[PDB]
Amino acid sequence: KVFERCELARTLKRLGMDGYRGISLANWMCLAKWESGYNTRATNYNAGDRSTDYGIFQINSRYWCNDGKTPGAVNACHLSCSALLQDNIADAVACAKRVVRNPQGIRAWVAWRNRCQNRDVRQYVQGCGV
Ligand code: NA
Numbered sequence: 086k087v088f089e090r091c092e093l094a095r096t097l098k099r100l101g102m103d104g105y106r107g108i109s110l111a112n113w114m115c116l117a118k119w120e121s122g123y124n125t126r127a128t129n130y131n132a133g134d135r136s137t138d139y140g141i142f143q144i145n146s147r148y149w150c151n152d153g154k155t156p157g158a159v160n161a162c163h164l165s166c167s168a169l170l171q172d173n174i175a176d177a178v179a180c181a182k183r184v185v186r187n188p189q190g191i192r193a194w195v196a197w198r199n200r201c202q203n204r205d206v207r208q209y210v211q212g213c214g215v
Contacts, residue, residue: 098215107114120142
């Protein structure tokens with residue numbers, strides 16, 4: 086499913102993301118936007134380390150979910166990577182929350198640093214009723 090901007094903003098708000106570990110909803114929106122264009126079925130294979138990024142937040146199989154094909158990988162979110170390809174993003178949100186409960190927080194995603202950090206992210210939630 087490819088979410089419409091405001092549709093997604095309310096979806097994430099209902100899932101408890103607004104301000105989770107100090108991260109505003111607009112930051113999460115900016116993240117999903119740059120990671121997958123709000124597409125829950127987005128995948129990216131990394132030939133170098135044989136891992137794959139899954140879903141709306143492009144969560145990596147080396148550490149966060151199990152796909153059975155990433156050498157020596159772990160499953161910190163205790164989910165099949167398939168759960169990160171569902172139209173319903175509840176599991177993806179639970180996993181993204183797990184990801185930010187680590188040392189770097191939202192900085193865990195390089196894309197956030199490149200296109201969201203120290204930039205205007207309010208635009209992502211404007212007019213969404215959140
Ligand atoms: Na894994």
